[PDB]
């Protein structure tokens, strides 16, 4: 496990360029029926695009919310199919979780997503090597809202505003059935205060200057 050396050897990163006044909001585990629509609305009221890492099994249940994300200018990412610990699977099951989710998202969004985020941040070097050759790009995160703990919006705001820098990639969740109401309300405080500091919200394709599709 050498996360640092991998950013020089593969398509793999934790944050973006230091010389741009840009940050990136990302959302995991969706789509869902309660939190994804709210996030989309608050992102609409703040003129902000984001990047959604969607589970393949959840895109099947709510195929229109996948389409709503892409139609509103957001970028869709691959978050595997059934959310397993990729460090505990073999190559064929790893490549099965990726390619299966890709075909589901390609059918709904109209493109094969280029960005992969491994659940729990767990991934192995050979898995990373395979995705690099397949023209993927894995992006983790550098600011953790730890919103799955069900924390409040004020707590998430101080946690985000206290650890955000140019190039920060922020992690939030739109998990079906999670305690994420404070994570949604935090967007009303996080987005304006970072704008006060001069930050612009971009998607992962714009931050790393690459296409959204593979
Ligand atoms: O994308 C996720 N789920 O879909 C996800 C789940 C949990 C965490 C997560 C939360 C808190 C601390 C962590 C420390 C190391 C690795 C992951 C951590 C980050 C992301
Ligand atoms: Cl490209
Ligand atoms: Na790592
Ligand atoms: Na980094
Ligand atoms: Na950075
Ligand atoms: Na409903
Ligand atoms: Na192959
Ligand atoms: Na920086
Ligand atoms: Na950062």
Swiss-Prot record:
<keyword id="KW-0862">Zinc</keyword>
<keyword id="KW-0378">Hydrolase</keyword>
<keyword id="KW-0379">Hydroxylation</keyword>
<protein>
    <recommendedName>
        <fullName>Peptidoglycan-N-acetylglucosamine deacetylase BC_1960</fullName>
        <ecNumber>3.5.1.104</ecNumber>
    </recommendedName>
</protein>
<comment type="function">
    <text>Catalyzes the deacetylation of N-acetylglucosamine (GlcNAc) residues in peptidoglycan. Also acts on soluble chitin substrates and N-acetylchitooligomers. Acts on cell wall peptidoglycan from the Gram-positive bacteria B.cereus and B.subtilis and the Gram-negative bacterium H.pylori. Not active on acetylated xylan.</text>
</comment>
<dbReference type="GO" id="GO:0016810">
    <property type="term" value="F:hydrolase activity, acting on carbon-nitrogen (but not peptide) bonds"/>
</dbReference>
<feature type="binding site">
    <location>
        <position position="79"/>
    </location>
    <ligand>
        <name>Zn(2+)</name>
    </ligand>
</feature>
<feature type="active site" description="Proton acceptor">
    <location>
        <position position="28"/>
    </location>
</feature>
<dbReference type="GO" id="GO:0046872">
    <property type="term" value="F:metal ion binding"/>
</dbReference>
<keyword id="KW-0479">Metal-binding</keyword>
<feature type="domain" description="NodB homology">
    <location>
        <begin position="21"/>
        <end position="202"/>
    </location>
</feature>
<dbReference type="GO" id="GO:0005975">
    <property type="term" value="P:carbohydrate metabolic process"/>
</dbReference>
<feature type="modified residue" description="2-hydroxyproline; partial">
    <location>
        <position position="119"/>
    </location>
</feature>
<feature type="active site" description="Proton donor">
    <location>
        <position position="173"/>
    </location>
</feature>
<feature type="binding site">
    <location>
        <position position="29"/>
    </location>
    <ligand>
        <name>Zn(2+)</name>
    </ligand>
</feature>
<comment type="similarity">
    <text>Belongs to the polysaccharide deacetylase family.</text>
</comment>
<feature type="binding site">
    <location>
        <position position="83"/>
    </location>
    <ligand>
        <name>Zn(2+)</name>
    </ligand>
</feature>
């Amino acid at each position: 496990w050498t996360p640092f050396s991998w950013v020089e050897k593969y398509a793999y990163a934790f944050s973006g360029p230091y010389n741009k006044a840009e940050v990136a909001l990302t959302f995991d585990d969706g789509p869902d029926l309660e939190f994804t629509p709210k996030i989309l609305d608050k992102l609409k009221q703040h003129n902000v695009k984001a990047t959604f890492f969607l589970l393949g099994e959840n895109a099947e249940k709510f195929p229109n919310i996948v389409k709503r994300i892409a139609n509103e200018g957001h970028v869709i990412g691959n978050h595997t199919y059934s959310h397993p610990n990729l460090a505990k699977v073999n190559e064929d099951e790893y490549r099965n979780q990726i390619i299966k989710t890709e075909e589901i998202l390609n059918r709904l969004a109209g493109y094969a997503p280029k960005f992969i985020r491994p659940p729990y941040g767990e991934i192995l070097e050979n898995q990373l090597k395979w995705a690099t050759e397949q023209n993927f790009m894995i992006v983790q995160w550098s600011v953790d809202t730890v919103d799955w703990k069900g924390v409040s919006a004020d707590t998430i705001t101080n946690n985000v505003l206290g650890n955000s820098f140019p190039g920060s990639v922020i992690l939030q969740h739109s998990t079906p059935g999670g305690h994420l109401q404070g994570s949604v309300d935090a967007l009303d405080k996080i987005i304006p205060q970072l704008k006060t500091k001069g930050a612009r919200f971009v998607t992962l394709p714009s931050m790393f200057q690459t296409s959204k599709e593979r």
